[PDB]
Amino acid sequence: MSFLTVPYKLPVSLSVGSCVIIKGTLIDSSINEPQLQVDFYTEMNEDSEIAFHLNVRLGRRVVMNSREFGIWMLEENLHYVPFEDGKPFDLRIYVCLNEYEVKVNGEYIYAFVHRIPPSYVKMIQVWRDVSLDSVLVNNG
Numbered sequence: 467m468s469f470l471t472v473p474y475k476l477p478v479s480l481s482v483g484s485c486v487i488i489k490g491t492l493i494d495s496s497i498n499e500p501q502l503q504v505d506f507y508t509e510m511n512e513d514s515e516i517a518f519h520l521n522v523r524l525g526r527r528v529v530m531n532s533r534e535f536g537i538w539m540l541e542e543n544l545h546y547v548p549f550e551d552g553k554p555f556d557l558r559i560y561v562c563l564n565e566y567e568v569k570v571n572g573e574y575i576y577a578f579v580h581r582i583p584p585s586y587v588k589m590i591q592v593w594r595d596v597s598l599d600s601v602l603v604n605n606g
């Protein structure tokens with residue numbers, strides 16, 4: 467089946483216990499830009515609040531933040547970058563009471579404490595030059 471077209475947008479409803487699962491492959495083909503970006507918006511509009519932002523800079527860092535009232539807030543940086551140019555990845559973002567649990571390829575890498583209640587998220591966008599296999603939201 468074909469890769470999803472990027473930028474890829476998905477309307478969503480998140481609650482405690484929801485799990486966002488993103489599968490794809492990153493390419494080392496950008497210059498001064500991340501190779502993957504994930505944004506959780508509070509409206510189906512790119513000017514709305516970003517409750518959760520993640521971007522991947524291969525070989526350098528994974529960056530997480532929020533954009534509240536138009537402003538990028540406290541940046542949280544990881545120098546553990548479990549993504550590899552040309553290799554497939556499994557990115558899982560699990561909504562807990564107090565944080566998102568960020569998981570890559572079966573490794574628990576970061577807990578991002580909620581700044582906006584995740585019940586306010588309405589749209590996920592996945593973009594940059596990722597070859598995107600699937601994006602889904604599950605719960606039980």
Ligand SMILES: OC[C@H]1O[C@@H](O[C@H]2[C@H](O)[C@@H](O)[C@H](O)O[C@@H]2CO)[C@H](O)[C@@H](O)[C@H]1O
Nearest residue numbers: 519521529530531532538539540541542
């Ligand atoms: O905080 C996420 C936010 O970062 C912006 O870029 C930052 C960059 O991460 C930092 O290393 C640099 O020192 O400052 C920049 C602020 O302009 C991105 O532009 C933005 O899209 C988010 O990714």
